[PDB]
């Protein structure tokens, strides 16, 4: 992988809460898993056509967002796995993510910008 680590992700549904997932950036794609050894990703977020921005959040530190610029209301193309094994579409307009430190946030941002620009 180009980068891996624990990050908190905000949900995309009615009651949006933060969950800690193991994220792996590789192949112009951002994956996340429940455990570091899980063979299959719980979520797949292709980075094509996505941009990244810093954001401030009232509850969690060190945040950034993946989003579609000038978005006319479209969801980000992604997959997500439910409890029963079902592969479904992601429900997100944005992915808001929180890193443990400012240094980790900066390093994830540089890594993600390097992936999308050249692919
Ligand atoms: O129980 P709810 O209220 O429907 O909330 C969902 C629940 O927290 C899932 O665990 C989470 O998926 P992951 O385990 O894959 O992180 C999902 O994130 P999502 O909106 O990004 O799919 C939430 O929407």
From Swiss-Prot:
It comes from the Eukaryota. Residues 1-117 form the PH domain. Changing residue 21 to A: Abolishes phosphatidylinositol 3,4,5-trisphosphate binding. Changing residue 15 to G: Increased phosphatidylinositol 3,4,5-trisphosphate binding. Present in all tissues tested, with highest protein levels in brain and adrenal. It is found in: Cell membrane; Cytoplasm; Cell projection; Cell projection, Growth cone. Changing residue 32 to F: Abolishes phosphatidylinositol 3,4,5-trisphosphate binding. A 1,2-diacyl-sn-glycero-3-phospho-(1D-myo-inositol-3,4,5-trisphosphate) binds at residues 9-17, 21, 32, 42, 80, 91-92. Disulfide bonds: none annotated. Changing residue 42 to A: Abolishes phosphatidylinositol 3,4,5-trisphosphate binding. Acts as a guanine-nucleotide exchange factor (GEF). Promotes guanine-nucleotide exchange on ARF1, ARF3 and ARF6. Activates ARF factors through replacement of GDP with GTP. The cell membrane form, in association with ARL4 proteins, recruits ARF6 to the plasma membrane. Involved in neurite growth. Heteromer. Composed of TAMALIN, CYTH2 and at least one GRM1. Interacts with ARRB1. Interacts with ARL4D; the interaction is direct. Directly interacts with CCDC120 through the coiled coil domain; this interaction stabilizes CCDC120, possibly by preventing its ubiquitination, and is required for neurite growth in a neuroblastoma cell line. Interacts with FRMD4A. Interacts (via N-terminal domain) with INAVA (via N-terminal domain). Binds via its PH domain to the inositol head group of phosphatidylinositol 3,4,5-trisphosphate. The PH domain is necessary and sufficient for plasma membrane relocalization. Autoinhibited by its C-terminal basic region. This is Cytohesin-2. The lineage of its organism: Eukaryota, Metazoa, Chordata, Craniata, Vertebrata.
């Amino acid at each position: 992988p180009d980068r891996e680590g624990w990050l908190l992700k905000l949900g995309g549904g009615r009651v949006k809460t933060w969950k800690r997932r193991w994220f792996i950036l590789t192949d112009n794609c951002l994956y996340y898993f429940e455990y570091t050894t899980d063979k299959e990703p719980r979520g797949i977020i292709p980075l094509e056509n996505l941009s990244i921005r810093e954001v401030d959040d009232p509850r969690k530190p060190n945040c950034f967002e993946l989003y579609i610029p000038n978005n006319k209301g479209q969801l980000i193309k992604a997959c997500k796995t439910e409890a029963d094994g079902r592969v479904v579409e992601g429900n997100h307009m944005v992915y808001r993510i929180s890193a443990p430190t400012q240094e980790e946030k900066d390093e994830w941002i540089k890594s993600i910008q390097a992936a999308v620009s050249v692919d």
